[PDB]
Design a protein around this ligand. Structure first.
Ligand SMILES: Nc1ncnc2c1ncn2[C@@H]1O[C@H](COP(=O)(O)OP(=O)(O)O)[C@@H](O)[C@H]1O
Ligand SMILES: [Mg+2]
Length: 321
């Protein structure tokens, strides 16, 4: 797996913009009529999430759905070790926040909230007297190559993304604290999401919600616990590139995709330092550790270029490991 796209019914700016929809299969239809042409195409897109109507519409991409499809499977791999990713990419107002952290009230949740929950349930259901996992998580915002401990509001004893000669990239301490208890964990997020509030320009940033699943198996053959960790990173990178303000953020990443998108002739040295964001995630992005994506589109015809822009180099995610 690795890719999917999701469209949002309509937002105010749209609702009053007397703008209807262009995006109507398993693939994305994309028209424009304000040029003539019929194109572009539909593109593969493992998943072309249809959520244009109302959660009452039988034909509706339910929240629980997107999870049981991308997240669920993505959580499974974790148990069997192997790290994983899930980025919500977009165009400001595309639907990234919802599809990752939705809304607190019953129903309207993201994959994050559901994923942990699963994890948590996954762990307490138990089955054997030697589990021992312990949940370790962190919530950072990457703004102008300038992280921020959404977990610990006043941070401290920090700087940027440092590289551990062997353990891989990380950051100066930051904030890392177990808790074990969905509710305990659930809370963390909350506090976090709030740590950011300047239109909310919290957009020119990207929030990484990474968790450290450590697995300790008991031998039952010459006592010998076995440390089996997995890294679970879900991000909501910036979106939409009138284009007041720039910064590596995008590009950095904008560079990686061209990379993982470049095999030719049957089946590398990988270029991501040049991509601070990719930095944060080594193996999980450069070979090893499966990875899936979610793009959120806007039904508005007033947004046919940016969105379309999204579809294309979304379709582009087809080549690497
Ligand atoms: N599939 C969906 N179902 C219901 N509401 C949605 C959906 N997708 C987006 N939204 C709406 O859009 C808003 C959030 O979009 P958002 O994730 O914040 O944008 P972005 O992350 O691209 O900046 C919410 O207030 C929500 O009502
Ligand atoms: Mg947002």
């Amino acid at each position: 797996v690795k890719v999917a796209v999701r469209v949002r019914p309509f937002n105010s700016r749209e609702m009053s913009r007397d703008s209807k929809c262009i995006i109507q299969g398993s693939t994305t239809t994309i028209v424009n009529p304000k040029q003539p042409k019929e194109t572009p195409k539909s593109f593969s897109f493992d998943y072309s999430y249809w959520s244009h109507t109302s959660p009452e519409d039988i034909n509706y991409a339910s929240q629980k759905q997107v999870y049981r499809d991308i997240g669920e499977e993505m959580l499974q791999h974790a148990f069997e070790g192997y790290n994983v990713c899930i980025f919500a990419y977009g165009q400001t107002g595309a639907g990234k926040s919802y599809t990752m952290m939705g809304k607190q009230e019953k129903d309207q949740q993201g994959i994050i909230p559901q994923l942990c929950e699963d994890l948590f349930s996954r762990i307490n259901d138990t089955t054997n007297d030697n589990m021992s996992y312990s949940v370790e998580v962190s919530y950072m915002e990457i703004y102008c190559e300038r992280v921020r401990d959404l977990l610990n509001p006043k941070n401290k004893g920090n700087l940027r993304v440092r590289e551990h000669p062997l353990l891989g990239p990380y950051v100066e301490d930051l904030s890392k604290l177990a808790v074990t208890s969905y509710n305990d964990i659930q809370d963390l997020m909350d506090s976090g999401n709030k740590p950011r509030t300047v239109n909310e320009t919290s957009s020119r940033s990207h929030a990484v919600f990474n968790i450290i699943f450590t697995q300790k198996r008991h031998d039952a053959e010459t006592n010998i616990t076995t440390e089996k960790v997995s890294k679970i990173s879900l991000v909501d990178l910036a979106g939409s590139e009138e284009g007041a303000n720039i910064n590596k953020s995008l590009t950095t990443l904008g560079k990686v995709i061209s990379a993982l998108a470049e095999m030719d002739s049957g089946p590398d040295f990988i270029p991501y330092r040049d991509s601070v964001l990719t930095w944060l995630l080594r193996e999980n992005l450069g070979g090893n550790s499966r990875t899936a994506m979610v793009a959120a589109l806007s039904p508005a015809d007033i947004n046919y270029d940016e969105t379309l822009s999204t579809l294309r180099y979304a379709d582009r995610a087809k080549q690497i490991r």
